[PDB]
Design a protein around this nucleic acid. Structure first.
Ligand SMILES: [Mg+2]
Ligand SMILES: [Zn+2]
Ligand SMILES: [Zn+2]
Ligand SMILES: [Zn+2]
Ligand SMILES: [Zn+2]
Lengths: 130, 103, 100, 56, 93, 55
RNA sequence: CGCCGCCAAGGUAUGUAUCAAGCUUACAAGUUAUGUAUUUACUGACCU
RNA sequence: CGCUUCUCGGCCUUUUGGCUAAGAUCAAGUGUAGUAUCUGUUCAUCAGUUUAAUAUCUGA
């Protein structure tokens, strides 16, 4: 409700700090912060916070890779699709276990959150799911 | 605690092989639990390649039996003298040969 | 829930008793444990909604704030038209944490 | 450390020994001097005192 | 104030991160350490897969991290069981 | 006077790189200078060059 | 018998490619596998 | 044909220089449910039990 009172640089420098805002054990912080990521990306576009949420996928710790998986789902569902899906397909080529599990669980929460809007994207992620 | 498992011991061997000898914070910066002093303690205790951690002999035992009688304590003093140099293997040899002399 | 497999549901016949959720578990589904797409109100039996058990959350058993819901994924799989999904037992979770 | 390196010619190693001995003489003669100066109260420098701690 | 003998720092630094980026860089540094030690030791059977885990090829065994592989040089000695493959390669010693 | 987190048992376990760990705290040295303000800033001992700030 | 009267450098970085005034001459000019001691990792939006 | 010397190339340490007080200092996490993978480790002939078929027991 107030995304016009900045210099457009602050929402980009707090989303890195919102990564360290995770691993808090209440489940209310961790369910509100993904909505904050979604409205940040609604404000300043889903192309710069996206690389931050994909760099949050090599942590070795849980409650920090699934809590950015949900953030990938919220940047997928708040603003329109086809802005997060090519890079989410691209990160599977990175030879690491955690980033591949993160992009698969982000596809899970993606289709879970979109429902009926997955009629056009099944043929695109079927070669990834195979 | 300092359990010092072998997966960290071989990493410490590779870190001593790459970096150096008096270079300890830079190699303890990659172990997630240990500081420099405990790594120094184990490397001068177990991981130095001049340590003869096995092959107990006859001459060093008869050397230390009238050397642990010169001084009853001070096993780390006589540890460069014997050449066993681990400073705890001498204690094991001492209590083992005193258990064998009592039985 | 699906997170802790040792929890069992009540599975008796559902009446007109509208289920409730606490402020800690608001928006949570009962079966799939999700947050989106609410479709069906939760109906529980009269034994699990009686006396001091009224206005009570389904999962944690705390004081209810909002109404409980089913998801559309539970609706089209028809996991809402089964028995009453009131969690009765509480084991190895929120019990040993009280002793620690 | 006694610095016994093998396979080395004698004139360069003993000229290194007398050069580090001359540096040691300058080092200890400056250590005595600034220790006496911070004893009687000449300088109040943190650099000189925190250096003279390790230089004693 | 003593501006010359204080613990100083440079402006615009940003500081140092939390535990996550620190042990991420620690695991990448231990990965580079393991790769350079097998580069010096010249091991042709060490292989990394498509998910960031290690494999002994004659062993056909997995290793979750670096020290899991570089402690597997003493046990289940198939490296001496390649003497049969060398005898198949050359009938004489 | 000051009571809020003076001992500060575990602050919040941050990193404390160089200066915020070992350096001195500037806020007591500025609140004490704020506390004696008319008699560290009095107008009539040296009545010459005065330097007013912006606004 | 009556000391003493304080400025600054030390901190908010500096290396670049364009665009006027400041200053300057106003000039020269057709081997699979088991059991266990035992770690390392991974999962469940696990949890005050 | 052999031998000594010189020059050119195919090359097997090259790290950002040196010195001061190793230049000085630093680096906390759980508890629950479950799984994968290393190290260590060890693998004489009828009848029935069991098992998809196999692999424990009693028998001479
Ligand atoms: Mg500086
Ligand atoms: Zn609840
Ligand atoms: Zn559901
Ligand atoms: Zn019920
Ligand atoms: Zn028996």
């Amino acid at each position: 409700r107030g995304a016009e009172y900045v210099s457009a640089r602050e929402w980009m420098r707090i989303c890195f700090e919102l990564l360290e805002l995770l691993k808090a054990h209440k489940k209310a912080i961790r369910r509100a912060t993904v909505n904050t990521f979604g409205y940040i990306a609604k404000a300043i576009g889903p192309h710069d916070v996206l690389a931050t949420l994909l760099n949050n996928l090599k942590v070795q710790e849980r409650q920090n890779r699934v809590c950015t998986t949900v953030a990938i789902a919220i940047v997928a569902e708040t603003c329109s699709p086809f802005t997060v899906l090519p890079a989410l397909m691209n990160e599977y080529r990175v030879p690491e276990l955690n980033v591949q599990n993160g992009v698969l669980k982000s596809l899970s929460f993606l289709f879970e959150y979109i429902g009926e809007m997955g009629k056009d994207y099944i043929y695109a992620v079927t070669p990834l799911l195979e | 605690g300092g359990v010092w498992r072998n997966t960290e011991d071989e990493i410490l061997k590779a870190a001593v092989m790459k970096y150096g000898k008096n270079q300890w914070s830079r190699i303890a910066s990659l172990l997630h639990r240990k500081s420099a002093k405990q790594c120094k303690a184990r490397w001068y205790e177990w991981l130095d390649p001049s340590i003869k951690k096995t092959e107990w002999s006859r001459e060093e035992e008869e050397k230390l039996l009238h050397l642990a009688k010169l001084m009853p304590t001070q096993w780390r003093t006589i540890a460069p003298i014997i050449g066993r140099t681990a400073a705890q293997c001498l204690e094991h040899y001492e209590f083992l040969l005193d258990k064998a002399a009592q039985r | 829930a699906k997170h802790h497999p040792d929890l069992i549901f009540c599975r008796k016949q559902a009446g007109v008793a509208i289920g409730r959720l606490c402020e800690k578990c608001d928006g949570k589904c009962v079966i799939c444990d999700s947050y989106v797409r609410p479709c069906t109100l939760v109906r529980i039996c009269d034994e699990c909604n009686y006396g001091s058990y009224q206005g009570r959350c389904v999962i944690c058993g705390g004081p209810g704030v909002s109404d409980a819901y089913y998801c559309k994924e539970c609706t089209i799989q028809e996991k809402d038209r089964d028995g009453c999904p009131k969690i009765v037992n509480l084991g190895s979770s929120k019990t040993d944490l009280f002793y620690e | 450390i006694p610095w016994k390196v093998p396979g080395l010619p004698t004139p360069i190693e003993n000229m290194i020994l007398r050069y580090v001995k001359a540096k040691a003489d300058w080092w200890t003669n400056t250590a005595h001097y600034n220790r006496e100066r911070i004893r009687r109260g000449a300088t109040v420098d943190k650099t000189v005192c925190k250096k003279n701690l390790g230089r004693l | 104030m003593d501006f010359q003998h204080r613990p100083g720092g440079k402006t615009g630094s940003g500081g140092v991160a939390s535990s996550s980026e620190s042990n991420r860089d620690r695991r990448e540094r231990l990965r580079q350490l393991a790769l350079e030690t097998i580069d010096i030791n010249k091991d042709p059977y060490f292989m990394k897969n498509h998910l960031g885990s290690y494999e002994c090829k004659l062993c056909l065994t997995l290793h979750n991290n670096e020290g899991s592989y570089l402690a597997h040089t003493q046990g289940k000695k198939h490296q001496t069981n390649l003497a049969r493959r060398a005898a198949k390669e050359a009938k004489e010693a | 006077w000051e009571k809020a987190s003076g001992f500060e048992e575990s602050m919040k376990w941050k990193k404390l790189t160089n200066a915020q760990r070992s350096g001195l705290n500037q806020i007591p040295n500025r609140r004490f200078t704020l506390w004696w303000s008319p008699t560290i800033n009095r107008a009539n001992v040296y009545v010459g060059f005065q330097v007013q700030l912006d606004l």
